[PDB]
Design a protein around this motif. Sequence first.
Motif, PDB file in Angstrom:
ATOM      1  N   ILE A   1     -65.576 -27.016  12.151  1.00 44.66           N
ATOM      2  CA  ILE A   1     -66.238 -27.998  10.859  1.00 44.66           C
ATOM      3  C   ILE A   1     -65.590 -27.713   9.658  1.00 44.66           C
ATOM      4  N   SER A   2     -65.686 -26.368   9.277  1.00 48.60           N
ATOM      5  CA  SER A   2     -64.537 -25.938   8.008  1.00 48.60           C
ATOM      6  C   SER A   2     -63.289 -26.445   8.210  1.00 48.60           C
ATOM      7  N   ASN A   3     -62.364 -26.607   9.214  1.00 48.54           N
ATOM      8  CA  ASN A   3     -61.250 -26.761   9.260  1.00 48.54           C
ATOM      9  C   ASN A   3     -61.143 -28.667   8.974  1.00 48.54           C
TER      10      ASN A   3
ATOM     11  N   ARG B   1     -63.249 -30.040   7.278  1.00 48.47           N
ATOM     12  CA  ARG B   1     -63.563 -30.388   5.821  1.00 48.47           C
ATOM     13  C   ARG B   1     -62.007 -29.996   4.982  1.00 48.47           C
ATOM     14  N   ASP B   2     -61.630 -29.134   5.439  1.00 48.81           N
ATOM     15  CA  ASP B   2     -59.964 -28.834   4.827  1.00 48.81           C
ATOM     16  C   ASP B   2     -59.135 -29.812   4.975  1.00 48.81           C
ATOM     17  N   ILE B   3     -59.183 -30.575   5.877  1.00 48.01           N
ATOM     18  CA  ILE B   3     -58.341 -31.843   6.336  1.00 48.01           C
ATOM     19  C   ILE B   3     -58.725 -32.902   5.400  1.00 48.01           C
ATOM     20  N   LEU B   4     -60.026 -33.329   5.444  1.00 50.05           N
ATOM     21  CA  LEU B   4     -60.493 -34.096   4.528  1.00 50.05           C
ATOM     22  C   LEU B   4     -60.453 -33.856   2.937  1.00 50.05           C
ATOM     23  N   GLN B   5     -60.232 -32.557   2.735  1.00 45.07           N
ATOM     24  CA  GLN B   5     -60.290 -32.298   1.233  1.00 45.07           C
ATOM     25  C   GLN B   5     -58.638 -32.686   0.773  1.00 45.07           C
ATOM     26  N   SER B   6     -57.744 -32.488   1.978  1.00 40.21           N
ATOM     27  CA  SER B   6     -56.285 -32.519   1.442  1.00 40.21           C
ATOM     28  C   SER B   6     -56.032 -34.025   1.134  1.00 40.21           C
TER      29      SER B   6
HETATM   30 MG   LIG Z   1     -62.201 -24.504   3.532  1.00 38.76          MG
END
Ligand SMILES: [Mg+2]
Lengths: 138, 135, 138, 121, 137, 137
Positions: free
Chosen positions: C65-67, C69-74
């Motif tokens: 889920i952390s990953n 999140r990272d992808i969406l944040q990008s």
């Molecule tokens: Mg992160």
Amino acid sequence: ADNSAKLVEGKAKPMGSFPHVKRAGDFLFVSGTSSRRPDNTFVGAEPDDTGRPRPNIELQTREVISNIRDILQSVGADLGDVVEVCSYLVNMNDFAAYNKVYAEFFDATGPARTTVAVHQLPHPQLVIEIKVVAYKPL
Amino acid sequence: SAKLVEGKAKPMGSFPHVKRAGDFLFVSGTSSRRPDNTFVGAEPDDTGRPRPNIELQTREVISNIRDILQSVGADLGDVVEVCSYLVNMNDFAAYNKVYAEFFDATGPARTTVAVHQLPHPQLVIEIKVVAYKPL
Amino acid sequence: ADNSAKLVEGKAKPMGSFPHVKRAGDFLFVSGTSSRRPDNTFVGAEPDDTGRPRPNIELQTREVISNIRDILQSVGADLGDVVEVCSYLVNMNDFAAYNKVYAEFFDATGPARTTVAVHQLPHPQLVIEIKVVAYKPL
Amino acid sequence: FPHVKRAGDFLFVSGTSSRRPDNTFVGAEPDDTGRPRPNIELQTREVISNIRDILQSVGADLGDVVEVCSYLVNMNDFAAYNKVYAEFFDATGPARTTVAVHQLPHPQLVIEIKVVAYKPL
Amino acid sequence: DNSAKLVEGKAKPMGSFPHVKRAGDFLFVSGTSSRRPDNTFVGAEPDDTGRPRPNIELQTREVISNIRDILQSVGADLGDVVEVCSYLVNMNDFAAYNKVYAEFFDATGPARTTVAVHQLPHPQLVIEIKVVAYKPL
Amino acid sequence: DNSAKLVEGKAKPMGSFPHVKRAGDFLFVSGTSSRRPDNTFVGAEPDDTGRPRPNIELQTREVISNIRDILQSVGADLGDVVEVCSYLVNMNDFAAYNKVYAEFFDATGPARTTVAVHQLPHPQLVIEIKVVAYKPL
Ligand SMILES: [Mg+2]
Ligand SMILES: [Mg+2]
């Protein structure tokens, strides 16, 4: 959005922290739905005299699609608005009977469909769970 | 909004090959099954026993998806999500090789899992896609 | 269109020729994501004393889920924009711990969720992979 | 190596795979990506050869085998496994049962075989 | 010698092996399905669309009947069976399989182990059974 | 006549069969689980939500102890076991199961085979074991 997610009164409490249905723009995403009742008993998995559940794909499929209809109705939509069905069996020997029930609800003119058998569903009595996408602009 | 494509294999149930919803196109899970209900890539050996070929099936599946999309004025360039269902991960590398014949990293998101069973025992791959194509 | 797909810097290289995330109008489709690191090791699959990987569903689920999140944040989005979660386990005995981690990140105001156990995921060390759909108009 | 246990006139051979004593595998050569490519033909031949070696260690051979239980992981591997089996046994040989299991003990494996043999001392 | 036997009127084994193998006082019966001599299957009649419809009750009864025929061909019977290993593909089939098992065996009969496997050698099968029998010559 | 035994005080078999069956000098023990005599299960305590949480270590230890009890009821013991067939449902349970196994048996003792099956007869189970033992009368 503010009221984009809905927990539907009278339906089985979801197995985790999520709603029965989530709106996104013009689309409605309906969480995977089983024949489980609110009291955590299962339609179409009546135990026999020994207490062993006897899953019935016809009964569970009809109840799953009925439950999905109720969920859609709570957010102002219905089965005619469904555009994608993803069906998860546990055994393809249940396919013919599941297909027969599916045809009671969806016509020409109906949603795209994909059916696979998964290794397990979240309860051992389940022989079908269906997730759908629906389309109905506000 | 719904479409039964001519000369494609008749769907297993009461559903179209593709359904439009607004700007989106949902394509039903597609196999290598031909219209005459034989399968590309599952030729029987001399005992009558099918011999699934993941490379051949994957190529025919994606070709079939292209054909379905083309019947409603779209193409593979419009695909935005691919979900692929294998039955055995030892088939992954060949599936992966064929996938790259059709799509690249500018293309759709992709998820690949092996399921317990597909709807016919001859099958080693089925793919469903979402495409985006405003009218 | 021309910039609709994104390969995210700092994320594990996709297993095939596809991006981490793909925009389609107001929607974002995120590729199935595992706990695999950019260096191709795995979070939550430390070898035991004989070298045999010991998968840990809690650790893997949190990393997955952390990953995501990272992808969406990008692409300027976040977990609050997620509207559909599809989770693929390999063993329903992992469900309770997976469910507990899911609740660390999402609640009933969040996305629709579907959870099944598949026959196999793309690496034998994995006990969870998740794909999501998010909604975030440009 | 997998262990054999005598009991009266019988020999019970532990389920046997193509794995070597150094934990490497016969018949699962990794691609350039590092992903194993299990080969049922190579693994089946190595398994049956391994069982022959185990039996020879206690004075028996494949001619003494009377029951074969074969565990595949994928029935699409059946035809090739079947052909290798015929290299070693025929219809005058052991009873045979073949199923695919959910998993074998290592993800590189596509076959494991356990046998019972008969060889009075 | 005469230790291995191919039983006439039974489905040809799908590999190069006998229906039953003697070893001293023991008989090992190869895994047996409901497949007929003509390679059709009892308990998996195709439906309207040509799709096999497996029936665990019908298959289980034919399996144990086939095993009985095989043993009787070498002068043994189900009273001689001492170990039964049953391979289902779906545990939802357990109760019906179990009821049929009781038609043929009881608690004075063989040990029994029942599991569901990933696949049997034909996709229409929902049960295959292997047995060990004891019958001194 | 007396070759089959239903062992007093053990979980009742799921079907019409005994816990153990003698054949000449051999004993065949039916697949054995952690199920208690009252048909609850050792090693699958429900969590807060009422969902069973299988524990491979607890189940494996109970399974082998039950097999020991069954053998002892017919005058045998674990030392007489010559073949062990173990059925997991997930290989991620393998290491812990193997550690418990080694607490009871020598590794060069009985022959052993371990696989993961699709399903066991109760969904709470993560291990079932069947054994063959050798013990002349
Ligand atoms: Mg992160
Ligand atoms: Mg060598």
